[PDB]
Structures are given as structure tokens and as C-alpha cells.
Amino acid sequence: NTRNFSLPQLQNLPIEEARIVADALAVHATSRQIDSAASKLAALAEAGLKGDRQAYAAYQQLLYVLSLSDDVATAQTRRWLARAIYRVEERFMPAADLSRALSEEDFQKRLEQEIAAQERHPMSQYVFSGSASRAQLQVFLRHQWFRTFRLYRDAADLLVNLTDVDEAAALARYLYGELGEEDEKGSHPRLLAKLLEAIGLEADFQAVSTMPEEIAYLNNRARAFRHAEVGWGLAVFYITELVVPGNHEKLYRALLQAGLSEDQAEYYKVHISLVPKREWQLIARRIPDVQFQNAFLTSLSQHFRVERAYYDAIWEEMQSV
């Protein structure tokens, strides 16, 4: 099916830029049609980020179609257009702006300070404790699907930009584990699908979010993993790998409490185990470079801002059911 292909999604977006983008993605699009789309998308992002709420929603939805549709025929042009948007977004976000590199120590300290200081979101705590209702746990898991199901593709984009063969090898090991090792039935998306199904939810591999904060989270994560300055991607990769085994263990026990079997909750179990590291040298190697430090730190801050708004919205939805 084609529900998450670019053209069906654009046909369903009742705004002027939808046809402009569709024309730019057509097989015989001209350079003028592509440039017009890029200009207009950049202008739209700028208005949104300046406070035009309709322009914000429109550019976010368009970026979601551009960056995350599954019709590979249009992927190169879609990513070309996404960059016109990313260039604007990156001008608006608070930048680390270091004139000189932090010491390996002040750098590692800044990371600890960001992390620890501001995972005990009141929602996580509610779920960890075993207090969530069926409907509330279903809300949580529907959103877990969106975060998990195509994470491996974002990691693959970083793999492509790691020119050093040993560094590519590290990402290839990550991907191999994430996709089930020798058995694709055990890929992490498929593990999570088994869990959703155990609690009466469908796990749609063509899922398209309608939650603004989830869209912004997925859009930011794809941007970060695809960025030509791999500091952006390494920041998201780092924080995900560091925090997952801990959250996933508490989620595992909460799910058992909820009446899921050990086999049904396997998704959360496997992360306690496989993720606790070798990938750290990718970061440690680059720490002396201030430009890597600026990208990494800026990316980390931006990730936290979008993640916080996303978790807040999930908590709100859970509270409303």
C-alpha cells in the first residue's frame, strides 16, 4: 500500500504548497519547479518559527512528508527540499557557539549536566510504577511504535556519512543487532509489533503521525542523523544508546505487571542486555574539535527540547483517556 508515499500524503494536505511540492517531485520536474518549492518551503519555515502558527503546522507536516515518506523514487529530491527547511531551522535554534573546544572533562561534565539535570518525567514515573490503565498503556505504546519502528533507518543514514571504515563497522554492528542478527523475525521493530499486538493494538509499518509534537520529534531526529556534520547524529545516537537500557528494564517489569508474558514483552528485555561502550570512541575521537563540539552540543539541546514537548503531549493524552 501507499498511505505513506509522498503523493497520496500531499493530495491530502489542503494548502498551496502541497501542489508546489508535488510538482517538484514529479518525474519531469524542472529546475525552476524545484527551486520554487525550496524557496517557498524556506519562507514558510521562517514564518512558522517567527510565530505564525498555521505556517508552523504547515511546514512541519510538509517536512514530515518530505523527510519520511516511503516512495524511494522521490527520495533524492525530497531530501533536497528538506535541506532548504533544515537550513532555516538551524538558524533559529540556540547554538553552543563555543570559540574554543571544551576539555575532554568539561565536555563530559556538560553532557552529564544536561542529562541528569532536566528521565523522571512524571509520565515515565506513572508508567514505571504500574499505575497506568489499559487505555493509558495503549496510548504509551502507540507512541513507542513511532519512535522505534524506523529508528534503524536513521542510524543507517549516519552509517553512510561515516567515511572511516572502522566507524562504519561500528554502525553496521548496531544495525545487525537492531535488525534481528541472523533472524529478521527478531528485528526490534518486529519485536515491538508483537508487543503492540499482545495489548490489542495494530503495528502499522506505514504509520503516519497526527500528533504535532511527535511529528516534530521524528523530523528533528531524521534531520540530526542525516546531517553532513556527524556531531548532530552522534549526539542523538549517544543519548538514545545511553538511556534506553535503563528505561527499557523498568518498562519490562511494568508490562509483566500489566499481564504481558515474558515472550510478549521481549522488545524491552533485549535492550537491558545488548546495549550496555564501543560506540563512545566515535565521540571521544572528535572531542578535541570545537566544531564537532558545537554541532554535538547544539544537537543535544535541540533533541531535549523536542523530546520534552513530545513527552509532555503524550502525558497530556494519557491523562485525557
Q: Least separation, in Å, of the C-beta of 234 and Ni ion?
A: 17
- Spatial separation of the C-alpha atoms in residues 164 and 157, rounded to whole Å: 14
Which residue ranges are tagged as binding site for Fe(2+)? Answer: 178, 188, 271
Kindly state whether residue 280 participates in binding its own copies, applying the rule CB under 8 A. Answer: no
Q: Is residue 40 a contact residue for Ni ion (CB under 5 A)?
A: no
- Helices 290-320 & 231-257, crossing angle to 10 degrees? 30
CA quadruple 82, 88, 90, 94: dihedral sign: negative
One residue of 170, 265, 275, 314 binding its own copies per CB under 8 A: 170
Interaction mask 89-128, Ni ion, x per CB under 5 A: ----------------------------------------
156 touches its own copies (CB under 8 A): yes
Binder among 190, 194, 286, 305 for its own copies (CB under 8 A): 190
172 binds, among its own copies, Ni ion, none (CB under 5 to 8 A by kind): its own copies
d(CA 141, CA 277): 28
Specify the amino acid at residue 246. Answer: G
Give the x-and-dash track for 22-41 against its own copies (CB under 8 A).
Answer: ---------x---x--x---
- 114 in contact with its own copies (CB under 8 A): no
CA distance 136 to 14: 32
Residue 213: all three cell numbers together: 509534537
Burial class (CB in 10 A: 0-12, 13-18, 19+), 38: buried
Using the minimum distance from each CB to its own copies, give the nearer residue, 126 or 152. Answer: 152
Contact partner at residue 248 from its own copies, Ni ion, none, CB < 5 to 8 Å by partner kind: none
Report the distance separating Cα 285 and Cα 273, nearest Å. Answer: 26
Residue 1 site contact among Ni ion, its own copies, none (CB < 5 to 8 Å, cut-off depends on kind): none
Q: Which is nearer to Ni ion, 244 or 290 (CB)?
A: 244
Query: If binding is defined by CB under 8 A, does position 79 make contact with its own copies?
Result: yes
DSSP alpha helix (H) spans, the chain: 6-11, 16-25, 31-49, 53-68, 75-92, 104-116, 122-129, 134-148, 151-160, 165-178, 188-198, 212-226, 231-257, 266-274, 280-284, 290-320
Secondary structure (DSSP) of 214-230? HHHHHHHHHHHHH-SST
Q: Which residues within the stretch 207-236 sit at the binding site for its own copies (CB under 8 A)?
A: 228-230
Tell me whether residue 90 or residue 249 sits nearer to its own copies (CB atom).
90
Residue 183 C-alpha cell reads as 533472524
Residues forming the site for its own copies (CB under 8 A): 31, 35, 38, 70, 72-73, 75-76, 79-80, 83, 152-153, 156-157, 159-161, 163, 165-166, 168-170, 172-173, 175-176, 178-182, 184, 187, 189-190, 205, 228-230
